[PDB]
Amino acid sequence: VCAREPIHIPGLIQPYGVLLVIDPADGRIVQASTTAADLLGVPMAALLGMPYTQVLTLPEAQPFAVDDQPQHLMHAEVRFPQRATPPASAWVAAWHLYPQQWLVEMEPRDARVTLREAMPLLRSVERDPGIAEAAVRVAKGLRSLIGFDRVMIYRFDEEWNGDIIAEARKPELEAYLGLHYPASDIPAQARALYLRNRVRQIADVGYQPSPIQPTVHPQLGTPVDLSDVSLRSVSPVHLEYLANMGVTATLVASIVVNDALWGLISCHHYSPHFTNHAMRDVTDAVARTLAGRIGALQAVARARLESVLLTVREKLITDFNDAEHMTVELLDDMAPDLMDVVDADGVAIFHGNDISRHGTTPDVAALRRIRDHIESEHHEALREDAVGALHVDAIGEVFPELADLAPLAAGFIFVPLMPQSRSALLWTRREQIQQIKWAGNFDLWQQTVRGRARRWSPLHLESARSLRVLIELMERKRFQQDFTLLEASLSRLRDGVAIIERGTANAAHRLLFVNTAFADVCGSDVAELIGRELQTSDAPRANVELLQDALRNGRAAYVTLPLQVSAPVYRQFHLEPLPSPSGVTAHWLLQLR
Amino acid sequence: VCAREPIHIPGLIQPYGVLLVIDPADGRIVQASTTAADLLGVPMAALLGMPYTQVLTLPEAQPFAVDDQPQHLMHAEVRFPQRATPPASAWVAAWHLYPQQWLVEMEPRDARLLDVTLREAMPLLRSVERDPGIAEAAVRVAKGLRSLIGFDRVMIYRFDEEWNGDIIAEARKPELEAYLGLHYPASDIPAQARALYLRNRVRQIADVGYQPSPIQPTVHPQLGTPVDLSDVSLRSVSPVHLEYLANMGVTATLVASIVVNDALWGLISCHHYSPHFTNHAMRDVTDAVARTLAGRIGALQAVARARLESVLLTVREKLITDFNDAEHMTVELLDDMAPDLMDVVDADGVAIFHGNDISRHGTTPDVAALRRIRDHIESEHHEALREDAVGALHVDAIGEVFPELADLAPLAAGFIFVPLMPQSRSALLWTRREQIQQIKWAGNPRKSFDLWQQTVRGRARRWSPLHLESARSLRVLIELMERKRFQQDFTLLEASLSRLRDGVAIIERGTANAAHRLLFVNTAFADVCGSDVAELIGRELQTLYASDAPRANVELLQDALRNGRAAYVTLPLQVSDGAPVYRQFHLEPLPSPSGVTAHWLLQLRD
Numbered sequence A: 001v002c003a004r005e006p007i008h009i010p011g012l013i014q015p016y017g018v019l020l021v022i023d024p025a026d027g028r029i030v031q032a033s034t035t036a037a038d039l040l041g042v043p044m045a046a047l048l049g050m051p052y053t054q055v056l057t058l059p060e061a062q063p064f065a066v067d068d069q070p071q072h073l074m075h076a077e078v079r080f081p082q083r084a085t086p087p088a089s090a091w092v093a094a095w096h097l098y099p100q101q102w103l104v105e106m107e108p109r110d111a112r113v114t115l116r117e118a119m120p121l122l123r124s125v126e127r128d129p130g131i132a133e134a135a136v137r138v139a140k141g142l143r144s145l146i147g148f149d150r151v152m153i154y155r156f157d158e159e160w161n162g163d164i165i166a167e168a169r170k171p172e173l174e175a176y177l178g179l180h181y182p183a184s185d186i187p188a189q190a191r192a193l194y195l196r197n198r199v200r201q202i203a204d205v206g207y208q209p210s211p212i213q214p215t216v217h218p219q220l221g222t223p224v225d226l227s228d229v230s231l232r233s234v235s236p237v238h239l240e241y242l243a244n245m246g247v248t249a250t251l252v253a254s255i256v257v258n259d260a261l262w263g264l265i266s267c268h269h270y271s272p273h274f275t276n277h278a279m280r281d282v283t284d285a286v287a288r289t290l291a292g293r294i295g296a297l298q299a300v301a302r303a304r305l306e307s308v309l310l311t312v313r314e315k316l317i318t319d320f321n322d323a324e325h326m327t328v329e330l331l332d333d334m335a336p337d338l339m340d341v342v343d344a345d346g347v348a349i350f351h352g353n354d355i356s357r358h359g360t361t362p363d364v365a366a367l368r369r370i371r372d373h374i375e376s377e378h379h380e381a382l383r384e385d386a387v388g389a390l391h392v393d394a395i396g397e398v399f400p401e402l403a404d405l406a407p408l409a410a411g412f413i414f415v416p417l418m419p420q421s422r423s424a425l426l427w428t429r430r431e432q433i434q435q436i437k438w439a440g441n442f443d444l445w446q447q448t449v450r451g452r453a454r455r456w457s458p459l460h461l462e463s464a465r466s467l468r469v470l471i472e473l474m475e476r477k478r479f480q481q482d483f484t485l486l487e488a489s490l491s492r493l494r495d496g497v498a499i500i501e502r503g504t505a506n507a508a509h510r511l512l513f514v515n516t517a518f519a520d521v522c523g524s525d526v527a528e529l530i531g532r533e534l535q536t537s538d539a540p541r542a543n544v545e546l547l548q549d550a551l552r553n554g555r556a557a558y559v560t561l562p563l564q565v566s567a568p569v570y571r572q573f574h575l576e577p578l579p580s581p582s583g584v585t586a587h588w589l590l591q592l593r
Numbered sequence B: 001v002c003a004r005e006p007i008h009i010p011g012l013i014q015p016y017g018v019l020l021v022i023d024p025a026d027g028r029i030v031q032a033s034t035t036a037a038d039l040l041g042v043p044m045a046a047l048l049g050m051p052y053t054q055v056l057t058l059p060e061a062q063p064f065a066v067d068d069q070p071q072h073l074m075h076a077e078v079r080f081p082q083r084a085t086p087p088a089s090a091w092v093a094a095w096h097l098y099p100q101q102w103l104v105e106m107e108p109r110d111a112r113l114l115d116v117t118l119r120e121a122m123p124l125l126r127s128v129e130r131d132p133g134i135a136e137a138a139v140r141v142a143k144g145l146r147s148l149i150g151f152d153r154v155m156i157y158r159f160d161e162e163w164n165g166d167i168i169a170e171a172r173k174p175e176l177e178a179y180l181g182l183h184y185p186a187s188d189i190p191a192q193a194r195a196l197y198l199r200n201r202v203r204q205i206a207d208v209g210y211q212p213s214p215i216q217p218t219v220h221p222q223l224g225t226p227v228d229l230s231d232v233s234l235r236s237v238s239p240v241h242l243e244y245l246a247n248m249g250v251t252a253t254l255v256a257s258i259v260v261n262d263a264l265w266g267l268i269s270c271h272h273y274s275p276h277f278t279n280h281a282m283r284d285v286t287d288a289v290a291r292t293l294a295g296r297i298g299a300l301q302a303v304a305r306a307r308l309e310s311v312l313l314t315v316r317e318k319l320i321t322d323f324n325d326a327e328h329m330t331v332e333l334l335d336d337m338a339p340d341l342m343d344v345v346d347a348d349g350v351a352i353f354h355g356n357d358i359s360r361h362g363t364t365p366d367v368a369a370l371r372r373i374r375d376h377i378e379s380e381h382h383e384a385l386r387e388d389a390v391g392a393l394h395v396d397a398i399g400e401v402f403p404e405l406a407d408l409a410p411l412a413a414g415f416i417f418v419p420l421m422p423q424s425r426s427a428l429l430w431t432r433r434e435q436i437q438q439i440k441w442a443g444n445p446r447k448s449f450d451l452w453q454q455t456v457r458g459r460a461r462r463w464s465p466l467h468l469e470s471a472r473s474l475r476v477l478i479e480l481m482e483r484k485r486f487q488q489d490f491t492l493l494e495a496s497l498s499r500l501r502d503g504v505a506i507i508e509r510g511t512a513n514a515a516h517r518l519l520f521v522n523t524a525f526a527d528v529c530g531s532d533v534a535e536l537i538g539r540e541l542q543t544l545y546a547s548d549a550p551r552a553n554v555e556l557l558q559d560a561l562r563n564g565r566a567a568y569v570t571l572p573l574q575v576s577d578g579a580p581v582y583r584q585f586h587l588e589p590l591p592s593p594s595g596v597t598a599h600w601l602l603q604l605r606d
């Protein structure tokens, strides 16, 4: 139920500032935070329904009507012309202009040489190698700039769990660097708002919130969507957490990379600390700058890998096409590249009952168990829902029966997906134990994750899909290998054979294959005979009819008929239908001693 | 010789400021620009070898020793304590701290838009950070920077794959002819110049045709090397380039590097037809917008690749299943397949070849013309082309690569051909029709002023590496066709053989560790033996005859197997029941490419 909280409609503000909801129609204040009455000259009752111009004046920029896309005015100087001296400090206001509402949030200026001071840090990260180096540079650098007791770089993993990859802290305290946090700690709903509103601040934990006096819109009958307002009251859940932790102030800047939430810049203060708009703007700058390099280094990385992976793949393709006899040594020379293209620990090449095991891989019988399990009708759903190839990161999860084997085959890539059989390819990765330091799931916990291999890189997975061609290459080569063998065998027979292709009644019944013993009795050789109509009257009408009726229907016949001599030569014509997938005769076997 | 100039060691400074080289060992000035003597108070002779501290009055930040990675201190307030009221304008100094040397460059403050300019630039950075597509961001940056600093010209120069430039965006005075859309050669910006723009991201010329300030002790007095400015903004630019700008009428420069993915994507070129020094605060804002724009361009490039890459895969994967599912390739199968098959590679046409048959689709040359192209590629002359090729053979302009096939270009200017090996029977030809290019040059030292429009013919749109990998990823449709065809024929011959009367078996020759086993067995054969076909495949041949069979007769058969020769011997069969069944074993070697027997044909009759 907690992971289902609205959070964007709390109907409360952080007391450090004031919020006003204005009807753009008349320009009158429809809703207001309880803190408004004190800052502005007039108490609540009269302030409600009053025009905004009457109570607050702003010289820099003014609100305006918006058509569809909401527009946001940044923090500018705002004055309160309705009281005999109301500035116990300087005030600054920001707008959120919607087509049905105007949202003005105001807070003190403060400031205390900032954007120029941040420039050397930005420049220094914008050119440093690897994420690690940049993360730690940003951590230390922001700790110097904004001055928080803790500055940590929190990276989201694939299942949205966090990891503190970088940290800058006071000499005292215990480092949270290296700690793992669940996905449950930051709900989807919350994560969305960090992508929306990039810099989030908790000025003092355990603040006494300011409720928006008219809770719902008096004419729209809805609460205030505070999704863009910085004054948005945080979940009491999270507040209790921070309070239990001893941290009293919080600054969180979103590390958005390629329009995706990559991670967060988490800042904790064990005393209260309001970060003013000007400073928030600097942290946003460093977050974007860091966010930038991470994606730059990620790009250069992909680029490099992508090429070498192709160079290898392409060697594999030629080497396989060039060789006509798939030998043990062929597969032994091929094996390293075949493993390398996908960064596997082992590979097993299957060719119907035969297994060419290479690298660090389970025993032949164990490999058979894995294949037999995948090819199963139970896991039939798995292959369909799969994309080009079937792959696992922890065999024990996906195939609970195959829970063991994991020390050598924790992860695997399997090609082809169809239970096509004969030729297949099993790439394996051995179990790599993970030592993960939790937040407590008064001391530390180290989960020692077993039965999982290193995650299959999407780039390696596409490398795998790109090798499906080696499977049909084997199959094609194998059929062609067998075909010639059977063609050889047939031609060397004594009992005169020929295959007959049924003409779709448009074409006549023509010869497809003819053996040497057959083409001899006829006289003329094989190449002259391929593509010659079987209808080759002298021969009794009765006997021919029997043969013609078998062809007419797609049935069998056994009839003695005279041939063509270069004695006239009579033979017994043994026509027989060969099984068709459709069940409708398309070919016949003709033999006749 | 010009394309191999040092430029990083000119031994000269831009007169607008002063440069000093300091020995970090005991803080003395080892080298100095001729402009140093006038602003620092003390003339050259005594100023040389003197500690920086005597003329130091920098309160903000001080230099320091470094270890390995050089560090740079930003422009801060510096004062000259040797003269009574030394200037008329405030002076600012920046440091370049190297482990062997310290480089301090100083110049006037000026400002007239400082951090007020940094807040003023914030909504522009904000505006581009949100912008869709490069084209919109480029033009936003152009207009925005033209407003932020009053340059007469602001252009966004994009480097193409061959390091040639294109002015994709431009913001200018109402007057002066727009250079927007103009193409520049790679030769105009040399490799070493390009390298420095990746090194020093922001570079300005205050006034073209400045009287340079030489570094009085030309080489280091103790290290014996010249001063590598590289990071110093005061560095003197090539006279070559200065003459160019002068000929062009421009007097002031400001060039901010658009570095994307650690590579020089392009430049923000700013021209002023009068002189214009852009202050420390000034340069800093352009750097910001340069950082921001470069950011967004890469972001959009990533999201873009990501999107395309997926839809291509989705299509590719439909084609794979659709092709595997169909067992007899019909005209309608290929007609339904055709659009996706063209789309996966963004082709104008495609021709599917299945030995003498051609399924041509889209905008493609005639059947005979297609045959000419294939026959030419499959040629022994162009054998080198297919070897040097990667997964598939691809052309961007058929007339160049295949001079004989110079025509056909209106419909097949570019193509992708698969498979690479002259494997034949099955193939795939993707075509792209001629797209004429109209490229506006600067001129074709060179006066420019007059532009030339090159009208390139016989070329199709460049094959995207993403589309080329899409093509390579479809080689599987070729072996799929071939496999299907061989399997189709094999099954036919296997059918034919199994329905025979004479009683046939194929034998696979073993080794010293393996035995001679039956590969194929018909019914007529498996009947005489008794036990069925599936219960006989993989059976050792020695099994088939009785263990009572005369030593003499078996020997003859064993000799033939031992050597890989033929034999014809009557032998009793291994009768489960007890009825003596004898047959003439007609073993015969089947032709091998090597000529060394690998299989035998066994026929039975006696």
Ligand SMILES: */C=C/C1=C(C)C(=O)N/C1=C\C1=NC(=C\c2[nH]c(/C=C3\NC(=O)C(C=C)=C3C)c(C)c2CCC(=O)O)/C(CCC(=O)O)=C1C
Pocket (backbone or CB within 6 Å): B002, B003, B005, B007, B155, B165, B167, B179, B184, B187, B188, B189, B190, B193, B236, B237, B238, B240, B241, B244, B245, B253, B254, B255, B269, B270, B271, B445
């Ligand atoms: C030696 C061959 C050269 C020829 C010919 C030529 O025209 N220039 C040559 C050399 C160098 N050019 C250098 C810098 C430079 N080049 C450009 C190019 C353009 N600027 C434009 O505005 C346009 C079109 C509108 C073009 C095609 C720019 C902008 C710059 C930087 C100076 C500036 O901002 O104008 C160069 C390096 C010089 C240096 O910094 O030392 C060399 C050697």
Ligand SMILES: *C=CC1=C(C)C(=O)N/C1=C\C1=NC(=C\c2[nH]c(/C=C3\NC(=O)C(C=C)=C3C)c(C)c2CCC(=O)O)/C(CCC(=O)O)=C1C
Pocket (backbone or CB within 6 Å): A002, A003, A005, A007, A152, A164, A176, A181, A184, A185, A186, A187, A190, A233, A234, A235, A237, A238, A241, A250, A251, A252, A264, A266, A267, A268, A439
């Ligand atoms: C319900 C689920 C929640 C549990 C069990 C919990 O502890 N918090 C839950 C919900 C929310 N968390 C939110 C924000 C938030 N969590 C963290 C977590 C950490 N931050 C750290 O610095 C460390 C360790 C060093 C951990 C483990 C952070 C950083 C944030 C963001 C704010 C911050 O800086 O802490 C929210 C959103 C709150 C809101 O704005 O309403 C919810 C809900």
Ligand SMILES: [Cl-]
Pocket (backbone or CB within 6 Å): A098, A225
């Ligand atoms: Cl809203």
